[PDB]
Amino acid sequence: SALPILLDCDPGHDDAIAIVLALASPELDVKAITSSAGNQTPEKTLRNVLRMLTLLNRTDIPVAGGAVKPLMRELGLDGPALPEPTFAPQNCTAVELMAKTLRESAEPVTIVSTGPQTNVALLLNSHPELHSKIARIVIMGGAMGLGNWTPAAEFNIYVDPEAAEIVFQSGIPVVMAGLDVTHKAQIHVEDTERFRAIGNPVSTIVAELLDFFLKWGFVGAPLHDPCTIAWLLKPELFTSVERWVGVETQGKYTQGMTVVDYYYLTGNKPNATVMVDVDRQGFVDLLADRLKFYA
Amino acid sequence: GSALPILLDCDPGHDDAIAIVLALASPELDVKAITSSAGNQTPEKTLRNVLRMLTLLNRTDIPVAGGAVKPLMRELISGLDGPALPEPTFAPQNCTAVELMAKTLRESAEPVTIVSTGPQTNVALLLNSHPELHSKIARIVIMGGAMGLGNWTPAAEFNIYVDPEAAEIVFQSGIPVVMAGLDVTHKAQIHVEDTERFRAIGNPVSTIVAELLDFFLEYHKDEKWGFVGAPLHDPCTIAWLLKPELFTSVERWVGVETQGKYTQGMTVVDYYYLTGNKPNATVMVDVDRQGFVDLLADRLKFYA
Amino acid sequence: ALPILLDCDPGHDDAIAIVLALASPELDVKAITSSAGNQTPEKTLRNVLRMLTLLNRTDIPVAGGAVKPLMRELIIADNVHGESGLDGPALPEPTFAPQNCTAVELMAKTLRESAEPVTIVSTGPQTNVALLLNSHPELHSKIARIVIMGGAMGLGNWTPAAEFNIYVDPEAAEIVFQSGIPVVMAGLDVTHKAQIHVEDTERFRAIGNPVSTIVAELLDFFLEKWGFVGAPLHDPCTIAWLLKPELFTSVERWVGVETQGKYTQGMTVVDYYYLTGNKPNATVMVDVDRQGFVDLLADRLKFYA
Amino acid sequence: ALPILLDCDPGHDDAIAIVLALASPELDVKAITSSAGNQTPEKTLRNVLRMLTLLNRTDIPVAGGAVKPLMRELGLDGPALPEPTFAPQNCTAVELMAKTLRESAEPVTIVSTGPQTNVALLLNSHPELHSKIARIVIMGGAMGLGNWTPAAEFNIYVDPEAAEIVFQSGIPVVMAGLDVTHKAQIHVEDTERFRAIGNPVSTIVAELLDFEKWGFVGAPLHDPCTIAWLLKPELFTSVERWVGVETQGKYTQGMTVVDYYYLTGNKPNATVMVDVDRQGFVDLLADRLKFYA
Ligand SMILES: [Ca+2]
Ligand SMILES: [Ca+2]
Ligand SMILES: [Ca+2]
Ligand SMILES: [Ca+2]
């Protein structure tokens, strides 16, 4: 009855916190966690997935490392003391673990990818016969408005624009947590104190990860990646629009931009659910309430 | 007569038309010439519309010339429907827009302000073909672009989209640029009450302006944008020259995308200073709407 | 014997390349996988199976690959190669099944279990090869080199600037050329010199076995703005180069594939006069001893006696 | 005589093109304007003035043009040349070109042997004068390999946007690219022939041509092919084809894409020179050099 999900990510503090949120939610059955490279080198992102799973006592979840660089371009949890990995990744690549999971699943699986789209694009292009086994792809990346890496582009998308465009043109429903929503999903100093007052080793780690992070004029720090998991858990916390998104791969000034046809100016059929607002307090409540799982 | 000397390049177009009305009712401004760009209409039509507006406004003394027939490297894509306008009673000068612009610069004793409220085609031509006159251009004030969402394609505003290369030439020119994009112009809405205020002013020109606002809103009320009233784009350029204190603006780097698969014509504004790039533009981002409406109605009294 | 992986989109010349490879005991064909380009992926796969049926090598593992280019829609070399993709001669129906997996999977499996580096020969669009490279960076060390048919230093045969295989999937080809693995390129520069004249096709037909018959009837089908004396035979130059590199003249140069141009998508940009900074990444074939090439083919056709 | 406008960036070969044009009474050179590419715009202007001083044609009006490409960033060593004895006109190249067209009674031929910057400016800013332009004869581009980047010839690469403007203009274009110019080589023996003609001008021309991976037998003479094609088109083989200039590629900015095998829908927009009778080209030059006897 739980929703089967594949998590692909590049921890990264917010990826890490998204893993914590997912494993505290019995509505979700995390089938595997695979690592992309962007926030760090692929050796480090893999290591970080293994450390998080060690911390959270879920060494039963299969892990594989993915692509070592973006498709056509060149190419992490400081703060708290984290455990050394006590287990090994699977002897195969992220795409292979993803494909394997799809093949053997009896119902469609949800992909949540919160690093660059590199591994997800590879799976899509290399396994067209498994597209039917993918319910939807939930991403953290992009920005309808101003980017955070270049003027037009958010980092995840900018690191591998081609991979992202492959995802959005794939024919599989996409849900997009871009900067428009994640910038609203701020954790204020008081919130971080709330998480820390919960009083278990994990809520402590989450609070310290957050401590570390601390021209945009944010009141507190945005928490990007957990917005993907939070939307699956409580979509009613979010406002979203169904629109066409294209990713720029050629521009002189705009490589990696997510072009969102908000006012229907193109002929293009919508391919994405674009998150545009969140109930910030509700988002904090969800995170604070699920942290009680590690009591 | 120490008014600010200005060159107006435009593609009327109801809002260009209203910009002309505002400028000629402002003795702070000395309009040296009006030239026509093509965008809102064919170049025959935009030229004609400049001539009709000057005929209406009893300023047949301002020299007019037609400009480029198409964007620098792309194909082109009455223009003042609604009110009855007069037929032209005077002829454009026997030259091109670029030639009239250059002439004006050469013979001006002080730098001239360019206001271009159509595509940037003529301005870019003047810039590239007269580098020895850059010193005679104080600044270029444009209506075009959007820091946020575009009104023509998802990423692009119309004027820039029609001639991205010309706009990039303007912004890379080294001459200070002032940009009235959709971020401010979409705030500069004329509500139905405002159009009634203009109409109550009671002279042939305020009547024309109100009827121009009439036609627009009746036939082009944007149902997806959720505007309370119709945005008045072009007059924001003139208003900023008249009362900059009505506006909020930031000094940022702006690039125009000329190569993107999805983004041709986008004005990329480096709002959060993420690039290395030296600011080249003053980007208007807010306006005091009521004050903007007040300016228009105060200046419409000129035609009493 | 040199272990090779063959990735191809038959297509008459791919087919004749298969024939040549299987008549050469210098080469150990480890698998044949199918790309889409010349035809739909259903048809290319079928035609690999038909050729292996014909040549009684049903022991070679076959798998179908990617159904479309990485980031573009499929276009096919439709009426050039006709209906089935191998029109002309009667061919046998497949008597065996492809492996239960994708081309990239069979490729990876082959590399993993090989004891020495494997040579990839790819004679359709580079789609499967690029997928293997990006998804298996830990197996690059098991790839000796990639030998392609594609590209043109001069004029293209599909658009003014581009050759078909490259044009169908420029992004795949650029991935191959940027990969760090040695590339050998049989482009139109050489393949347009590797013409089979009517006399040569008559020679193949005179060899008198079922297979040389099929190869001759295949060429028959492939027969005026180019002003060729007879028909260029593109794909078998990859295998010929592995068999007898002394037939060929080649230069080591930098090659880039254009993925963004308005007029030039799919161009192979070859830095023939060293004008760029760029480190050579390819061996580009630029000439062939045509008669020697024809001799090679005919000599190896005797294998099917 | 055929009225022509010469826009160029001397440059030794532009210089030799000027020499040939002024020795040809079939041609009426209406004006010479300077582009920037081979050198800075100050230098190219100066060189036009030096050449016309040398050749005793200070009566031909000269103007300096654009100081850089339309959208991008931006010369006669060897022989002793005279200092300029006259001044350029007090206007820009585009102005002098427009003025020339306006006051011509019949269409004018434009020969542009530098980047196409001034010609593109003329075309875009004077659409009412297109009818006064018979054709634009250019030295630039390559159907085959480039001499500047792998895909691109210099003149075109310097201002790809100006070149694409010219080719998309609707005015007939004639293209002397590397395909023909690399065949138009001057061998050591030819340079000695020129030198033996025995006047100050043939001497200057020789001292220029006097001064590796391409494997040329002698030096290609690029710009004079434009003037030669006007004088003796029968020396050349050419094809009527569609030509587009790449202005966006990652690796191919400045490439002239010639649709030699009719693979696009596109209407031909250009006469593309593909061969030359080299000896006949050399004979034309030697023959015309006698003008300065
Ligand atoms: Ca992340
Ligand atoms: Ca306008
Ligand atoms: Ca093939
Ligand atoms: Ca030159």
Residue numbers in the entry:
A (entry chain B): 1 to 75, 86 to 224, 231 to 311
B (entry chain D): 0 to 76, 85 to 311
C (entry chain A): 2 to 224, 230 to 311
D (entry chain C): 2 to 75, 86 to 222, 230 to 311
Quote from the publication:
Two CU-NH-encoding genes are present in E. coli cells, termed either ybeK and yeiK, or rihA and rihB, respectively. The gene products RihA and RihB have been characterized using steady-state kinetics and X-ray crystallography, and display similar kinetic constants, characterized by mid- to high-micromolar KM values for uridine and cytidine. The structure of each monomer maintains the α/β fold that is typical of NHs, with the Ca2+-containing active site located in a deep, narrow cavity at the C-terminal end of a core 10-stranded β-sheet surrounded by α-helices.
The molecular replacement method unambiguously identified four independent molecules in the asymmetric unit, arranged as a tetramer with the subunits related by 222 symmetry. The N3 amino group of DAPIR can either be directed towards the α9 helix of RihA (as found in chain A, as per PDB file nomenclature), or towards the αL loop (chains B and D). The diaminophenyl ring of the inhibitor, mimicking the nitrogenous base of substrates, establishes only van der Waals' interactions with the side chains of Ala78, Val81, Phe165, Phe223, and Lys228. In the closed structure, the highly conserved His82 residue of the αL loop is interacting via a hydrogen bond between its Nδ side chain atom and the corresponding atom of His13, in a side-by-side orientation. The structure of RihA with the inhibitor DAPIR describes the enzyme structural rearrangement and interactions when bound to an active site ligand, underscores a buttressing role of the tetrameric assembly, and provides a snapshot of a structure sampled along the reaction coordinate.
